[PDB]
Amino acid sequence: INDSFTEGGYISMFYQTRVVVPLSTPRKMDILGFVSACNDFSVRLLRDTTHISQEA
Amino acid sequence: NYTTINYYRDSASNAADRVMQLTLGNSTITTQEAANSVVAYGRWPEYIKDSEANPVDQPTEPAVAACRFYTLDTVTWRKESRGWWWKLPDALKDMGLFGQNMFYHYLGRAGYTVHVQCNASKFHQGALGVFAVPEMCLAGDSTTHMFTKYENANPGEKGGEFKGSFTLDTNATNPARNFCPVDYLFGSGVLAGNAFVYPHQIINLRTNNCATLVLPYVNSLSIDSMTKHNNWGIAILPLAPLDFATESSTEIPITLTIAPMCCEFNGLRNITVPRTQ
Amino acid sequence: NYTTINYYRDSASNAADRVMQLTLGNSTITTQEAANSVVAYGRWPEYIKDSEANPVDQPTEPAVAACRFYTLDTVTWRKESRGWWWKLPDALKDMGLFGQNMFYHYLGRAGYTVHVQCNASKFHQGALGVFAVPEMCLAGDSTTHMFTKYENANPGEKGGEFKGSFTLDTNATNPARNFCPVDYLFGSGVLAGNAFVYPHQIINLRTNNCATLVLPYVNSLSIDSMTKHNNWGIAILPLAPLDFATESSTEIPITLTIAPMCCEFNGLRNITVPRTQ
Amino acid sequence: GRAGYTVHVQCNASKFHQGALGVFAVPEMCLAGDSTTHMFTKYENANPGEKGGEFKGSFTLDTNATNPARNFCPVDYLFGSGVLA
Amino acid sequence: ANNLPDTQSSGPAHSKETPALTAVETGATNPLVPSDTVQTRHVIQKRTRSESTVESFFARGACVAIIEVDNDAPTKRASKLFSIWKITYKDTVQLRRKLEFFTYSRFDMELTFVVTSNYTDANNGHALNQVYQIMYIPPGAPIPGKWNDYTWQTSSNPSLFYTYGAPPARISVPYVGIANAYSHFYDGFAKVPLAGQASTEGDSLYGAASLNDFGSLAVRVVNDHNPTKLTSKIRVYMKPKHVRVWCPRPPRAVPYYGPGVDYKDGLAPLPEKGLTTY
Amino acid sequence: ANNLPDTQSSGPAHSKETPALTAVETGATNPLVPSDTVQTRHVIQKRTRSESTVESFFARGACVAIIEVDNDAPTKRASKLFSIWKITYKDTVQLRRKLEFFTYSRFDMELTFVVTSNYTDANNGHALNQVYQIMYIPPGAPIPGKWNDYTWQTSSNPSLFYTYGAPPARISVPYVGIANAYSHFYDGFAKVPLAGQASTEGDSLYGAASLNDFGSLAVRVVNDHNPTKLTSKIRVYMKPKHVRVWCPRPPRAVPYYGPGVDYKDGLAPLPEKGLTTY
Ligand SMILES: CCCCCCCCCCCCC/C=C/[C@H](O)[C@H](N)CO
Ligand SMILES: CCCCCCCCCCCCC/C=C/[C@H](O)[C@H](N)CO
């Protein structure tokens, strides 16, 4: 959960130099982001998620 | 230490890389800009083993007659394309002797080699996610649950397209009874960004021209009815939209070539003629 | 005899002397009237072991650049003094390259050598209790719980003073949001006379001029944020009031010299600039 | 104080750019001043910091007697020290 | 389930080997560790993935049904003296989502029945302790039409007789799928419509098959009616045991709408946040 | 925990060794025994420190919460059909003091739930035996807004279903701290306010962190409402098990005032007694 004592940190992305393209090339491009865990990752204390709910 | 003793009979009661050539039959595929090839779940397609054979009658294995590459209709990738889907073996039901064996037998089983081809210049942009989804169930377009009819659920080699937004079919007199696959929901109420849990490959136009997926036969049964059940679903989504030199209106073809592998059929009868759309 | 058997998987379910010289870096301390030196909990400061390292990135160990004695501002001991407190590493946040490493890294760890100096003649009286308190939480001055602000909780090298009696901050418009440490309650609702359960030394002016405490890094984590969390608190209380020859108005300086030891820092970024009082 | 160095000069340009940079490490890189007084460059100018200084196309003499600049005058083709670049 | 690998110390690196640079086009996740990109110390790992196992993930009793029954009188047409509930995990969302993380599953099941009863009115007297009969009706077996018809003899149907006030009743079931695994998803039909026959014939619901046909539970109060009405509810908790799962899928992101994968509402699950806002 | 040393006989002494004279300035407690200052006989000690162990000291169930719930009707706005209780030992003083004898602790926990219910009025009928659902909600998990919303499916949240009249419910928990020990005290903040940002931002409560964030318990009565209101109370008893503690502190001498170390009242704990009065 969003918690101050156990806050994780900050990921950020910056231009190191810049994106350079020649002529007759799209000047705007897209990057896609992916995340995953490493082999040292682990969880515990199984609980109920807040991403699914039911009505009535 | 702790001691455990079972007090019952039934155990249920117990406590808990780039250059590649693929030859199948009389068909051959050469690729020079490939991003390797993925074997779904690391399992190569295989024939049913005697230890897992449910049907008793002798199977028929057409081998090269049906285990060969068939090329589907090419689709066009534009800036406005939302994605396409096909169902296997449904996409191959009208493809040579494979479809004949599919419709002459009650039970069929096959893995696949899916080869997606999309070539573009070095001045093009765009990425395609190509996903092999077992049991690719798609959401319908009506307030009635599970109301999609057989004809629309099995479009054939043309497949279907994803939609930008969900539209509800309110025509009570003549309901469409068609799918409404939303691209960002992956057509099944799940975020498309998580679709990468499925076997997949990305065609990034700056890196590769093609994707290859070796799908083993995946099912809760060793062999099933190919006319009733689609083992796999191939979903192609534009992850990065197509772009080119600011000219606009650019469109590049995407071609799909599927080879069934290790085909086994059981229960020969008169041919099945499914109702058409 | 009795028999015990565990019927569950998780184990949680199971049943229940005088002359001394201290050299660190380019700093040296000589003492001739010392009352020995205390190592808190008998544990010498040490570096994180590979068996207990949480962060994966390589630490930085400035060694002599930061592991050296820094002298804080001198305080004055009078007959009316109630005591003083400092927070570590907070008291060293503006001390050479130690503070620089403290603010340039997200995680920091260090033990300490605290040397309290208070020299007086053979015709002076008074005793100082010098206590090293892990997690020296102090009580606030408002009806709002835990309302002390960061700026006051981290005074720096000046530290704070204990109070004879508790005063409540009734200023609703501009609350002080400062500590109110009562000397006989040790600033935390506990009798000061029991504070000797903490590592400590007494400077009795008839016996010794100084106290030395070697504090190991103490925390529920192997390494933490030095800007968020003060590992230690140094509390000095007059156990016996200062007196001298009946002249009155006598005041003698107390100087505090702290050397961080075995400094380890992780998570290098841009420098942290905390908000000032 | 004593230290060696790793100097990394970075200059990226496309495949349609031209130009060459000579990057020289000079021990005791003494630079010529800009006044008739020998060795008259002051400490503040001799130690610009991370900004450094620029070479000059031609030598200019500082004639301001009242408020001399007391700055360097490194000429590019003389390498700033009376030697051909 | 077992222990994680340790972290090895890593010093500075200067080489032509570039683990950071990869190509996700291959579909392969880069198996990097912290020591590849940053300098690391040695950490003797003691954390474990014991609670992340598929067994632990499903080792909870999840409510799947609330069956309501009454004990009022045969004459009363508004009181349901018995209730039939088709066995399924899709009447509730939480277990359904946890299960639909995977395409196929195979497990034994543990059913726990928590029965709570109450009075509905005060000025009609009181009641004696009730006995509930929960009869399992596999597909094809006769279904009770009345609360006291012959079907409740249970000569062959398994039946549970629960005394009110006793601890919640409990039974275990082996894997009873006619296939080799339970199909959370079935991309197909039970019938193939054949050319020639009328559109009425051959029409089958999408994704529905007899793989998920498990029969029903018929719940009644065995006692005769007291002069006052008593309303009872049986809560069914399902716990998978000896779980095996295959073919992981992305979890349900939007509200469920029916037994299938249909969605109709809440199609905007993600909130708004700035691209450069932390 | 083990046996104490014996007492050795001591005769008269006349020497230059003076164990009595010491210097407390060193901070070291003089380890004298009776034989050092007085003549002693030989005593074979049989007393032991078995009940003074840290395990024995904490081996009691201590009430930490009284959660009140109701079963009246959805319409009634004055009846709380479910109650959420943040998990903490600071709602009660006795266990809090025993624990705050130490700075750090690490232990498994045993939670025992004693449920007592009663009627609130007489002329509305009677009720059937109630079932209570106690759902553990770890931080980040959805929190019920109604007594019968989807959250109570508990597909992943651990849940306890207690039948009224059964023995008090009980569960065990391992050490679930994200740090290597529980922090009874945290001399710090969760945020560091940064120069430049407004005084509203960066402001954090002193001593509060996510180390002590353990989620909450949501308690409801699963039964539908009877025509009469029933009020129930769940009492939570916490027993530390396999206790390790570090850094002893002087015990709380003045009344607790809030979750921190704040004091406001009863600052004069000691009575008056003459210096030379026995
Ligand atoms: C003793 C009489 C009443 C209790 C007996 C009822 C037995 C019913 C057990 C077999 C049917 C359910 C088997 C498993 C259910 C679903 O298939 C799984 N959730 C599939 O994931
Ligand atoms: C089964 C559902 C309801 C019962 C399960 C609730 C589990 C909650 C256990 C974990 C949170 C509490 C852990 C320990 C509490 C405090 O940290 C200790 N008193 C610290 O000294």
Side-chain angles (χ1 to χ4, degrees), chain E residues 87-89 95 99 105-109 111 113 134-137 157-160 171-177 182-184 211-212 214-217 238 240:
Chain E
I87 295 172
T88 180
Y89 60 86
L95 178 62
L99 273 176
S105 57
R106 185 187 166 92
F107 54 78
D108 301 328
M109 201 180 61
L111 294 192
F113 306 87
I134 305 164
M135 176 173 57
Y136 174 42
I137 306 176
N157 280 341
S159 194
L160 236 187
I171 57 96
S172 55
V173 187
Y175 169 76
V176 300
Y182 291 134
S183 298
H184 301 158
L211 300 168
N212 58 283
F214 300 116
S216 54
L217 303 184
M238 181 181 302

Side-chain angles (χ1 to χ4, degrees), chain B residues 1-4 16, chain C residues 5-9:
Chain B
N1 298 323
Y2 64 97
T3 304
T4 304
Chain C
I5 302 181
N6 302 331
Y7 319 109
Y8 301 92
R9 286 271 284 174

Side-chain angles (χ1 to χ4, degrees), chain C residues 47-59 264 266, chain E residues 7 9-10 34-35 38-47:
Chain C
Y47 285 100
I48 301 177
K49 310 168 190 171
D50 292 321
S51 60
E52 306 186 353
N54 190 25
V56 302
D57 76 331
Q58 174 64 4
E264 243 165 323
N266 280 93
Chain E
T7 309
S9 72
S10 169
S35 58
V38 296
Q39 286 190 232
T40 52
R41 61 170 300 164
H42 182 244
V43 179
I44 293 169
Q45 193 56 270
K46 295 176 182 184
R47 295 190 271 96

Side-chain angles (χ1 to χ4, degrees), chain C residues 19-20 28 35 46 74 79 87-88 96 111 125 140 155 160 181-182 192 198 201 230 233 235 247 249 264-265:
Chain C
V19 190
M20 197 175 62
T28 306
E46 53 194 2
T74 290
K79 307 197 200 300
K87 298 294 184 63
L88 286 175
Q125 294 186 166
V182 177
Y198 302 118
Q201 277 206 317
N230 284 308
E247 271 203 341
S249 64
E264 243 165 323
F265 302 92

Side-chain angles (χ1 to χ4, degrees), chain F residues 87 89 99 107 109 134 136 158 171 173 176 182 214 217 238:
Chain F
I87 295 172
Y89 60 86
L99 273 176
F107 54 78
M109 201 180 61
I134 305 164
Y136 174 42
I171 57 96
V173 187
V176 300
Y182 291 134
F214 300 116
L217 303 184
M238 181 181 302

Side-chain angles (χ1 to χ4, degrees), chain E:
Chain E
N2 284 119
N3 297 264
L4 305 171
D6 295 352
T7 309
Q8 310 300 334
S9 72
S10 169
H14 190 132
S15 67
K16 300 177 290 185
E17 305 172 320
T18 68
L21 291 175
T22 173
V24 308
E25 293 80 355
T26 59
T29 294
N30 209 2
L32 298 196
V33 299
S35 58
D36 293 335
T37 55
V38 296
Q39 286 190 232
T40 52
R41 61 170 300 164
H42 182 244
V43 179
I44 293 169
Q45 193 56 270
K46 295 176 182 184
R47 295 190 271 96
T48 62
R49 286 174 172 185
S50 54
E51 198 168 14
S52 171
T53 67
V54 165
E55 256 296 331
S56 300
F57 187 69
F58 292 105
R60 249 56 155 187
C63 187
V64 290
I66 309 180
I67 305 168
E68 184 176 344
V69 295
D70 300 336
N71 186 32
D72 186 358
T75 177
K76 301 272 181 294
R77 306 89 156 84
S79 58
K80 213 189 176 191
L81 306 179
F82 75 103
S83 286
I84 296 154
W85 165 76
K86 176 76 194 71
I87 295 172
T88 180
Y89 60 86
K90 294 184 179 177
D91 300 358
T92 59
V93 300
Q94 297 183 347
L95 178 62
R96 187 189 175 175
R97 194 169 184 264
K98 293 179 76 187
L99 273 176
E100 293 182 348
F101 266 90
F102 303 91
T103 312
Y104 309 112
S105 57
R106 185 187 166 92
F107 54 78
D108 301 328
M109 201 180 61
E110 183 192 60
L111 294 192
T112 315
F113 306 87
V114 179
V115 192
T116 70
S117 193
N118 67 283
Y119 293 92
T120 64
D121 56 350
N123 53 334
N124 285 332
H126 307 138
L128 297 174
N129 213 65
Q130 288 161 294
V131 171
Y132 301 77
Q133 187 181 0
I134 305 164
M135 176 173 57
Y136 174 42
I137 306 176
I143 304 177
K146 306 173 186 179
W147 78 280
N148 63 344
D149 62 328
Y150 72 95
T151 54
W152 307 95
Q153 293 174 23
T154 53
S155 83
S156 305
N157 280 341
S159 194
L160 236 187
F161 282 90
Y162 168 84
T163 306
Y164 191 79
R170 172 175 276 176
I171 57 96
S172 55
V173 187
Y175 169 76
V176 300
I178 56 170
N180 299 89
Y182 291 134
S183 298
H184 301 158
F185 299 85
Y186 176 77
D187 183 5
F189 296 81
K191 301 176 182 179
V192 189
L194 300 181
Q197 69 190 12
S199 183
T200 58
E201 188 178 17
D203 198 321
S204 177
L205 298 185
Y206 178 69
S210 66
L211 300 168
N212 58 283
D213 185 6
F214 300 116
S216 54
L217 303 184
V219 181
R220 69 167 183 155
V221 172
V222 184
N223 303 61
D224 282 338
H225 65 279
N226 309 270
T228 188
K229 173 170 194 179
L230 263 62
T231 48
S232 312
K233 282 181 184 169
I234 292 73
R235 279 169 168 85
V236 187
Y237 297 82
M238 181 181 302
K239 195 181 86 170
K241 288 159 48 160
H242 318 127
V243 179
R244 302 177 65 178
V245 289
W246 299 265
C247 297
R249 325 172 64 85
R252 185 71 179 193
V254 297
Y256 286 118
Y257 187 64
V261 308
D262 304 79
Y263 40 73
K264 199 234 187 181
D265 293 326
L267 303 181
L270 271 42
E272 183 249 318
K273 187 145 190 63
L275 178 56
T276 50
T277 301
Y278 288 103

